[PDB]
Amino acid sequence: SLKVLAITGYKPFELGIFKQDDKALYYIKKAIKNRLIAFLDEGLEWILISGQLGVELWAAEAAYDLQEEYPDLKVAVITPFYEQEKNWKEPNKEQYEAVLAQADYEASLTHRPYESPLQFKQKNQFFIDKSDGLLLLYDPEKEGSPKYMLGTAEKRREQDGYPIYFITMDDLRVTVEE
């Protein structure tokens, strides 16, 4: 049973999305909320993100818009290290802070700022190990930043059938027409 869902996906630059304005962002969030609704009616308790800009924060925001009708849905933000938002633009810092302020749980796997790629590696392994499945907004042709975490998920799938779910560019098209 899928109680804890990890969610990741593209950073804003990968999609060319720089304002919450924003046409495709409406459809991205709608696609996320529609997946979550389905998971919720199959016993979803927790979503888990690391606080990454783009899809991770947008997924938390989507979950927060659903908690009124699904008050048992909880959001955990577990960061790989401290102050990951330190060099982001002010509006992005604010977006991040708003998400962390509202999370049911939040912690950092290491009690220090960014030190080495090892903190990302360890965080990804933790997320895969401690969740029941992974949802990605990710496209296999484009590839990009989420491929790394996907790989770690696929290594678990190979072993125990850990389910992986995608919102591809084709999925976003279907979201638009419906």
3-state secondary structure 28-74: HHHHHHHHHHHHHCCCCCEEEECCCCCHHHHHHHHHHCCCCCCCCCE
Alpha-carbon distance 145 to 134, whole Å?
Answer: 15
User: What spatial distance separates the first Cα and last Cα of the chain, rounded to whole Å?
Assistant: 29
DSSP string over 62-115? HHHTTTTT-TT-EEEEEESSB-TTTTS-HHHHHHHHHHHHH-SEEEESSSSB--
Distance CA 103, CA 85 (A): 16
Tell me the structure's resolution in angstroms, rounded to a single decimal: 2.0
- CATH code linked to domain 1-178: 3.40.50.450
- 41, 42, 36, 43: which is closest to 7 by C-alpha? 36
Q: Hey, what amino acid is at 17?
A: I
**Collapsed DSSP state (helix, strand, coil) of residue 166:** strand
Dihedral, 137, 143, 149, 152 alpha carbons, nearest 10: 120
Specify the 3-state DSSP secondary structure of 6: strand
Provide CB contacts within 8 A for 35, sequence distance 6+: 135, 165, 167
Query: What technique determined this structure?
Result: X-ray
Cβ-in-10-Å burial (0-12, 13-18, 19+) of 56 comes to: buried
Task: Say which DSSP state 116 is in.
Answer: -
Q: Report domain extents, the chain.
A: 1-178
